[PDB]
């Protein structure tokens, strides 16, 4: 469902991940949270075009890919951390031709260059771990 979906979340993106398709995720990080993940998955393989992994221990926003069975190299640079324990966040994820563009609370968070060139393979949005979702629009 769109409002208050429980975690873990499993959303079927109908007709694949489309260029210009925007995902909105509004949620809350618990005081006790250590980690949660948002994966843009291809179901057949289990490959992940984009794994976004906020980790509260170090306050990192980890981005990586799981392609051909292997983890790529991690991208971590941010200008802000919207995922502090006990915080609400509003994430807007846009799938561009060349990159994902992610904004948190209307402020740019990161861009992630496509590693899976064929982004249309992605038909699975997965959100899992220590996060409470108020709203997910796919």
Ligand X SMILES: CC(=O)N[C@H]1[C@H](O[C@H]2[C@@H](O)[C@@H](CO)O[C@@H](O[C@H]3[C@H](O)[C@@H](O)[C@H](O)O[C@@H]3CO)[C@@H]2O)O[C@H](CO)[C@@H](O[C@@H]2O[C@H](CO)[C@H](O)[C@H](O)[C@H]2O)[C@@H]1O
Q: Give the binding site for ligand X (CB under 6 A).
A: 37, 39, 51, 53, 62, 64, 71, 74, 128
CB of 55 to ligand X, least distance (A): 8
Number of other residues whose CB lies within 10 A of the CB of residue 65 = 23
Q: What is the full DSSP assignment across 72-112?
A: ---B---S-----TT-EEEEEEEE-SSEEEEEETTEEEEEE
CB of 70 to ligand X, least distance (A): 10
Please say whether the beta carbons of 42 and 124 come within 8 A: yes
76 annotated ligand-binding residue: yes
Q: In terms of CB distance, is 31 or 57 closer to ligand X?
A: 57
Q: In terms of CB distance, is 53 or 92 closer to ligand X?
A: 53
CB of 7 to ligand X, least distance (A): 11
Please say whether the beta carbons of 136 and 28 come within 8 A: no
Q: In terms of CB distance, is 6 or 106 closer to ligand X?
A: 6
Q: Which residue is nearest to ligand X (CB)?
A: 64
> Of 34, 38, 13, whose CA–CA distance to 92 is shortest?
38
Q: Which residues are annotated as a binding site for a beta-D-galactoside?
A: 71-77
């Amino acid at each position: 469902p769109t409002f208050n979906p429980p975690v873990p979340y499993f959303g079927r993106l109908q007709g694949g991940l489309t260029a210009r398709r925007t995902i909105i995720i509004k949620g809350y990080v618990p005081p006790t949270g250590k980690s949660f993940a948002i994966n843009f998955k291809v179901g057949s393989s289990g490959d992940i075009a984009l794994h976004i992994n906020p980790r509260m221990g170090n306050g990192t926003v980890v981005r990586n890919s799981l392609l051909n069975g292997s983890w790529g190299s991690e991208e971590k640079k941010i200008t802000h951390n919207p995922f502090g324990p006990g915080q609400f966040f509003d994430l807007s994820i846009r799938c561009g031709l060349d990159r994902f563009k992610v904004y948190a609370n209307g402020q740019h968070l990161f861009d992630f260059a496509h590693r899976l060139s064929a982004f249309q393979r992605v038909d699975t949005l997965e959100i899992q771990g220590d996060v409470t979702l108020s709203y997910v629009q796919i």
